[PDB]
Amino acid sequence: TTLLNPYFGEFGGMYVPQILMPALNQLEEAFVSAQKDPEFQAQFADLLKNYAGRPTALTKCQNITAGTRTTLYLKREDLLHGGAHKTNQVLGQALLAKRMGKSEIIAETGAGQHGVASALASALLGLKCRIYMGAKDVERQSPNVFRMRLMGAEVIPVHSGSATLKDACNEALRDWSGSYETAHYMLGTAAGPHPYPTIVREFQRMIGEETKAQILDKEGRLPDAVIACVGGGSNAIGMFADFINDTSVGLIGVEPGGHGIETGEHGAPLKHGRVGIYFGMKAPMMQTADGQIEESYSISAGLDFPSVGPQHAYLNSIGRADYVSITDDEALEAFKTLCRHEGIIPALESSHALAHALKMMREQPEKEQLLVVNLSGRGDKDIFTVHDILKARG
Amino acid sequence: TTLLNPYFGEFGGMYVPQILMPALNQLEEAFVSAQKDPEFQAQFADLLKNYAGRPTALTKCQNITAGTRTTLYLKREDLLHGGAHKTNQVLGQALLAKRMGKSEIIAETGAGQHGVASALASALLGLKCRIYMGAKDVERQSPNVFRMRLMGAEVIPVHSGSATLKDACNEALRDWSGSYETAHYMLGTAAGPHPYPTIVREFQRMIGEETKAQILDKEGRLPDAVIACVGGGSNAIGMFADFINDTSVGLIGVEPGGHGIETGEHGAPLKHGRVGIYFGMKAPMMQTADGQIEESYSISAGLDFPSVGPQHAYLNSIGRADYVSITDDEALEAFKTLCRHEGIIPALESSHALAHALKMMREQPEKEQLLVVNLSGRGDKDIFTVHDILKARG
Amino acid sequence: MERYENLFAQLNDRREGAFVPFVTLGDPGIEQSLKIIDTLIDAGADALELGVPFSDPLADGPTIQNANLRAFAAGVTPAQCFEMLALIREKHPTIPIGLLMYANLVFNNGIDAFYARCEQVGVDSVLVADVPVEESAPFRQAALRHNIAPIFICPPNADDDLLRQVASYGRGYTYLLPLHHLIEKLKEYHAAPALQGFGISSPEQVSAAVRAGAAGAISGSAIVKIIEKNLASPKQMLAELRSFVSAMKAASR
Amino acid sequence: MERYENLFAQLNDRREGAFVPFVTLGDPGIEQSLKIIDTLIDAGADALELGVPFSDPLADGPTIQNANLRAFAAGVTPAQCFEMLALIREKHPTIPIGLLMYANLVFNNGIDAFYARCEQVGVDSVLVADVPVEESAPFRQAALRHNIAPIFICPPNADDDLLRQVASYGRGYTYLLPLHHLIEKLKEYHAAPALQGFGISSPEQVSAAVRAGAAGAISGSAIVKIIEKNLASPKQMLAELRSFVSAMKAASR
Ligand SMILES: Cc1ncc(COP(=O)(O)O)c(CN[C@@H](CO)C(=O)O)c1O
Ligand SMILES: Cc1ncc(COP(=O)(O)O)c(CN[C@@H](CO)C(=O)O)c1O
């Protein structure tokens, strides 16, 4: 059986071949043990604070909300070591691997951010790290691939199937199935077979825990809503977890709407896909009518996971969180807006969350509302992309 | 006369055309006033903490010092908003411009980091910012130029003279001479005419002030030496200022030795140039025998200022600080070493400081020593450069 | 289910092992796949395990992965795979036919509906490769309601608790992946007869598995490599298949 | 110094203003520069202000910047500029010759040595463009020891304190950059005679500066534009120079 529930309502589970069961059970026991071990908690805290740079700032954006009754804070996960929130849970998961006595790490990555996080954590903590990434994604992420390798990680391109994230995801599970005795599979989002949706939440929840502390300090009350992008669901479950029992605080996840939901070219399975079973879980997925799994499209490379974490599916089903979508052009507009009015260049993944907050403000400019957007990463990595588009349109 | 001394021993001064005197005097009076104004200090602190992300971490590097008796901490200015220490003093200088009622900013930049800092501060604080940069440097810093412009700043290439930093420096002074009534010249290093070497120090000294607090907390005593790269001298005077009266703590500045001091192709005027008068100050400079000013060469673009701040020249003259040089290949080796053993990719400017600490450790591996290197910036921006070299050599 | 019981009872009376080849339906296209299958049965296959192509076979090695890509290059879909199974059954009424499925293709249009479609076309068993025993209840129940054997893998990292659940939940055969001991415990817990799987690619391993107490052997990818090597000559492909299968079958006697 | 006193005393007896053109030594090369200078004096220049090329003329506009780049394209150095000044003085013993220098070229080999070299070649004054009165003491003292006039700019943003220091420290002439008032205060503080500078590029501004009480006018870049426009024809360049200077000089009468 398991120590913790593997389901969030009907979603989640452990849909993996029998041979990987013991690996999962082992990971879950290690995790439950770590969570009660003051020493583990103190070592995690020490690396977050002294290596990664926690707590991150909560920044109030006054120029963007001028002339409206919206006050907007941005949670600055873009200032963590590595430039995204991915760094938090890699540290936690690497420390768990050590705790289980493992000495190698296996990771999958799409845009390359989680790949770089896993290669930095493994360089710091002395683990030998190999990283799988779709050939098509290696091709368009050379800077990320080379950082991984400067950091000592082996990057393995995956040419099977679509040569994108889901294929890297399968290869990583394939490898772990035969090496879990000395290797840990460092999954990069709050999705996949239990226990990963739980572990990743619990290793990202300092996001929301810090935001609550910092918004009470600066405004003396909780936010009306917290808003985050949802690719697999980790940054967002990390911002929402410590608010789930605060019933007045709205939780809004934003999926990429790509060229527009009507086009079909999007990455919004929670609201526009269909439940299926893949990547070790039951959850909403981009899939054909006959059940083949398909790619998610977005202008942002990091919102490419073609399904969503089970805990999101569950919090949508019971109406505690609301999920919306934002298209490429709306995200690009929010990216430009933050650069020019606040001097922060956001990842285009996080620009989806900002664009939705901007729509909340602009659509109802005299509604008084206190909103926090999770700025999951910095957007230095996206400048070429934005340059080219801006160049293809003038 | 002036309120504060414009000299550090024989170095420094106000060697500018008469027409810019009143601008300098005005800036110095504003500054002296700001420094006694609790409100100004509180607004600066608030932006450093909540926008820029201070205090930065002090990270202990245990894998790099293994098997030696050196303990090395790295001061993480690479985690400040913008990825370098330049952000600190731009905030202070922008707030001063506002205090003097100015609404435009003029800045010069070489590698583009100070250009990006000034364009972000001016986007946040509502100032209209134009930036001068040598044509040759615009040419090799397109990503930096485009970030400046996404942030709303006007970037002006400078084709006169060598088309590099010193020429941008002259153009910026030219412009200010005719616009100081509504524009502030936001100089990017601790050099130039008084009061700038003083202002920049005082707006970077939280570096050293935080390092002292954090090293006493973690080790219970002060460092044996603090080590920083020296291009114009700002990151280093910011790390050394709060230690100058702590006589046991060694201060070591590191200038780029380029291809090797013997080749002549370097950027180390403090120890290998000759005192001259240029850029509004008397200080050591790269110059020909007949007194024409020349460029500094380094593999790192940001150590290109062809002179050095006067306060460095003075602290070297009286033996309180020691200055050394590190070549391109030593800096590149330190860059690789930090990536693979600590998971931090440093700017190649800061890799000069690290390479000198690494030499202190390796040359005398049983000497017990506690060293802090100022990691002035992150080195995401240098990956292509390192890629190409590594590619030209295999 | 019944066809397995009939087959093993017949092999036990001839003191013979089963030899069960695996192939991907539709690889390298439908017509050639129908003919490969006919050849494996003419050559002596006692039962078949048939792959339905799925986009993300996270439980298959490279050989099979490539088999899927060839099948998808041919345009094959699960609805075509089920037309093929109906045809294959109308040709060979007694040979037990097993499917190797991914869970999403079973869950897609409703799990009970998938097993009702299996039953209508004449499938005898289904191994869902990414449903462990822990998650299998709706799969096994629907399988049983439509008289289809749910097959489970008994991994080498198996412990007692697992051996008991595989013995209680599985029917038709147990897919075995301390060989002699696992077998003895499965027999002790009255599990479905064990087929040794994985690695099986020469005659001497077939004889070895029968010697160890298994009811037979399954060759998980060797048939697939023969296809891959012979894509340029369909006639040489059939010839080597037949040759390979007659030799493995001979070894089970 | 003496040559200025002699010149202004002579212009005052003819109730005339000085006209003083500026050119960069060696632009566009040495031989052509010697000839431009001869032409400006033949045409009526009462004194000369001569630029030494320096890498980073942070106090010059674009016209002059380009003049330096042409001079450096020709290979000109300060040691060549001083050979040129010696030659120019051996040709024209009374015309006061002013240099417009950057501080680094004066400080380079020692400030007193620079002014001793000026004195030996026959220079009368030096304006150091980036030394304000606040920093000028070593420059003015060395200048005075070698009988060279230190010239200061009196900026439009000048206040009383400055006007008094420029009047006390300057000699030869004051470089003026409430026009009528500045002049009156300079006279009141017995400053060196004022030359109006900047902007001076037509005859009517020369007459205007004399009318306002200045002792004359200096044309800071107009001569330089004439060079730049005529680079392709050295003979047309001399002709327009002569024409331009005779007209400006005529206006001062
Ligand atoms: C800045 C940033 N913000 C958000 C996300 C989305 O992931 P999440 O929903 O798990 O937060 C990503 C993911 N990026 C993943 C998937 O491509 C990776 O392997 O890098 C991100 O990089
Ligand atoms: C990371 C980093 N570290 C160090 C320095 C050197 O400047 P300093 O000596 O003033 O600290 C620079 C300077 N860069 C300047 C000069 O090119 C600029 O205009 O960006 C830097 O960018």
Ligand code: NA
């Ligand atoms: Na998704």
Ligand code: NA
């Ligand atoms: Na320098």
